[PDB]
Amino acid sequence: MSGRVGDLSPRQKEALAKFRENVQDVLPALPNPDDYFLLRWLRARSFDLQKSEAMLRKHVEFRKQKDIDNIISWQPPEVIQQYLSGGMCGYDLDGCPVWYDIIGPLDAKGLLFSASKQDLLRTKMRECELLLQECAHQTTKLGRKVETITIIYDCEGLGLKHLWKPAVEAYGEFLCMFEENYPETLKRLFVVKAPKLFPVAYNLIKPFLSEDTRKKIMVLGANWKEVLLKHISPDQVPVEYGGTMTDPDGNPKCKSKINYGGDIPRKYYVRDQVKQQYEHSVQISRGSSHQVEYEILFPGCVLRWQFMSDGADVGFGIFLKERQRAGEMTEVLPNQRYNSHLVPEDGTLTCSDPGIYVLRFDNTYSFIHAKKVNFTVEVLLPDKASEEKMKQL
Ligand SMILES: CCCCCCCCCCCCCCCC(=O)O
């Protein structure tokens, strides 16, 4: 059996009936606690009554604290409405709403510098409620239950700038929220136009995804447009993605439904940086330097770092190798001075050649003494399975 309405084993039916009795006290506060609704929670925890109940009660508490009942009427900040990419557009062959995620032109720094992380997360919650509401409308129009969504995840333009830690963490917060509050809602997710950086980028959010979500992700190759047309009718897919749908004015991208992001104009900023902490701190003497070592053995790794200096700029460069002078080592990222005391510095480097990498903070050119440098560095690894897919497609 599949644990779905109309296909329950006697044990699952008994569990469903018991589950309803056990959570009776919170059902009135729910929009429509039918059997489909309850079974999403049971399936998400393999019909373990205790875990399923804990999951649903936590969701109920979440709805209360986030005022989900009124979130659709809540209007997100102007900068978010204008620049947060993505959009609901069309229905798949089964009648399920399709959601488009446009990663490339998303300006995470711009959004985080112009709005609170709370409003960003709330906007995402709202999109989820808008999608569920669309499912409810499709259920009425099609005369049958529609409760899942199809996602087209456009990774064209995915680059190193998207690995910026604060953005990834915020996104991770959304994903955990989605996994805990909208179980059994994702039907299928098509990753299209995934670039070379995909395996590393995916490995960053993979920890936030449930096994059920991971199994629904399909990384598509060169024939992605044809694959989409096997699940979605051509008139329901924008011209931009291989279909025939366009905006009334003839735009192939259907911008009336899909937001394509873009960099946020400086006039919207309310800050030039987000609050930041570092895992390490060193005091560098005048005319001296400090070396930080990381062994990179696996190819395809990416070094990601963030650092700030106190009161004065500092030099920074990355080398490949015991304490050697910069000149004795191989220069991978040319040493340069950064005003990391004015604006926090962050960066990434793709590590092609394995070896011992040395990030070197340089103060050899200065008399300013005891410069305090705060930094955080990580070696980002590629998701093995994803690496293999990139070789196939
Ligand atoms: C419903 C959401 C499912 C999640 C699907 C994730 C598919 C892989 C996404 C990799 C994204 C790369 C990281 C981008 C981080 C950012 O937003 O800046």
Curated annotation (Swiss-Prot):
The modified positions for N6-succinyllysine read: 51, 253, 257, 389
The answer to whether keyword Transcription regulation applies is yes
Q: The GOLD domain covers which part of the protein?
A: 275-379
Indicate the principal place this protein occupies in or around the cell. cytoplasm
Q: Where is the CRAL-TRIO domain?
A: 76-249
What is one term from the GO cellular component aspect held by the record?
nucleoplasm
Lineage: superkingdom: Eukaryota
| Keyword terms, alphabetized | Activator, Cytoplasm, Lipid-binding, Nucleus, Transcription, Transcription regulation, Transport
Report the Gene3D superfamilies cross-referenced here: CRAL-TRIO lipid binding domain, GOLD domain
Extract one GO molecular function annotation from the record.
vitamin E binding
Q: Which GO biological process categories is it annotated with?
A: positive regulation of DNA-templated transcription; regulation of cholesterol biosynthetic process
This chain belongs to the protein called SEC14-like protein 2
Species = Homo sapiens (Human)
